[PDB]
Amino acid sequence: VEGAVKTEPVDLFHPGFLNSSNYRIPALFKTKEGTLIASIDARRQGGADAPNNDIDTAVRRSEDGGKTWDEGQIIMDYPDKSSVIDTTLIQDDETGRIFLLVTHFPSKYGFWNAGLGSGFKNIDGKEYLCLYDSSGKEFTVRENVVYDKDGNKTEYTTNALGDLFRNGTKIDNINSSTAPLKAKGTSYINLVYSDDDGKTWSEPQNINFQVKKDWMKFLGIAPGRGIQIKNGEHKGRIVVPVYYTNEKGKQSSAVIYSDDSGKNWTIGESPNDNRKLENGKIINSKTLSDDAPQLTECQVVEMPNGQLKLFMRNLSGYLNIATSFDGGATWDETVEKDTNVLEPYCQLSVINYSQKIDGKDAVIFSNPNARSRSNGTVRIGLINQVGTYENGEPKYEFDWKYNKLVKPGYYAYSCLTELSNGNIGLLYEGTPSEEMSYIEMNLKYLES
Ligand SMILES: [Ca+2]
Secondary structure (H helix, E strand, C coil), X not given: CCCCCECXXXXXXXXXXXXXXXXXXXXXXXXXXXXXXXXXXXXXXXXXXXXXXXXXXXXXXXXXXXXXXXXXXXXXXXXXXXXXXXEEEXXXXXXXXXXXXXXXXXXXXXXXXXXXXXXXXXXXXXXXXXXXXXXXXXXXXXXXXXXXXXXXXXXXXXXXXXXXXXXXXXXXXCCCCCCCCEECCCCEEEEEEECCCCCCCCCCEECHHHHCCCCCCCEEECCEXXXXXXXXXXXXXEEEEEEEXXXXXXXXXXXXXXXXXXXXXXXXXXXXXXXXXXXXXXXXXXXXXXCCCCEEEEEEEECCXXXXXEEEEECCCEEEEEEECCCCCCCCCCCEEEEEEEXXXXXXXXXXXXXXXXXXXXXXXXXXXXXXXXXXXXXXXXXXXXXXXXXXXXXXEEEEEEEEEEEEEECCCEXXXXXXXXXXXXXXXCCCCCCEEEXXXXXXXXXX
8 A cells, every 4th residue: 555665575694695505594683772683594504404404693783774784794603513503582671681592403413313401410519511422421511621420620621612622722522523522412502692782792601401301302492582571570581482392202382581681591381281182181291292282483472461472383283372470480271272373383473562553452473374384474463351361360362453465485484573663574484495585564564
């Protein structure tokens, strides 16, 4: 219509950018200062997931509302087919610190063959990263010094990038396929941060010791963004969607969260914990042994009173939504299936919108509206309180009042942001692993 805006797509990442052949897995976030940060997997050896690749994390910034973007930078890169995969962005409003988290695998490891547990061992009240030699002998890294099983210092030291030094000379990296001492072959959650609006980034901090349980095999970032809670008793809490597998390989969603501006993290329960299924049975994420109830990648939004809603990739064919009354620590037993929203087993994006639409609080949602990864559609969901739970808490559901096709044909992972001008930015996989497309839309367009 007149005044409607939908910009022509720009290839924000593409083959050749930063000398990467392939790209996947978008994250997009507007900072407190108004800067757009876009992160992505720079998939260097094709488009496949780890372990069949060598994947680095790339970031671009825009200081003019997404009209122009910088030359990009690689902010994490491990050697020899060790990969960082699946990024997420959030910022602490209090300190201004921006966080990017990502899943990290040593060479040869991925989802399917990840070992159990955090990869850390507790020695006298502190968690230390374990290393193993080819015989399976176990060592610990204590303040970057490698100790043997009997507590004796060895000739080895490490750095935060995993480099392995013998008497101060680098010989390998503990994440490579050739190191004489290697980290456990499993998933790790890495965190980096920026205190200058995304221009420079810290080295990765491995937070597996805080968030990964002994019985988890895979634990990964659910890519996109996090939130910081605005209302209620958990105001200020930083919440980052994740998902994990149990010993039987079955997937369950959750969030990790920090109440101290990102310094310390913990993981909450999954909506699969004490979940009541349609058949009336109760399950738990630790014991889940069936494929059908799996809950995987997810994104979280906040209701008017602070209540959290976790929107989840799943196997039902439709959107699933979980509810938390305690800031992500636990979830209500009922996972809602919203049959107005197809979910063809793919990542989705959902964000809060800052102003009311048609007199209602609203969210913006993006995914492939089909039984395949196609028909990419952005929706406006208006929030309605439809009743209360037995515990007296408000019960909220969504009215998907406006639903707009934005990408005919291929559409896979995506990430939304609200822009400074009130419009919506969207970075999406409009090709399987090549060009990643950015557009800006206004509400006039979305409602048309
Ligand atoms: Ca690399």
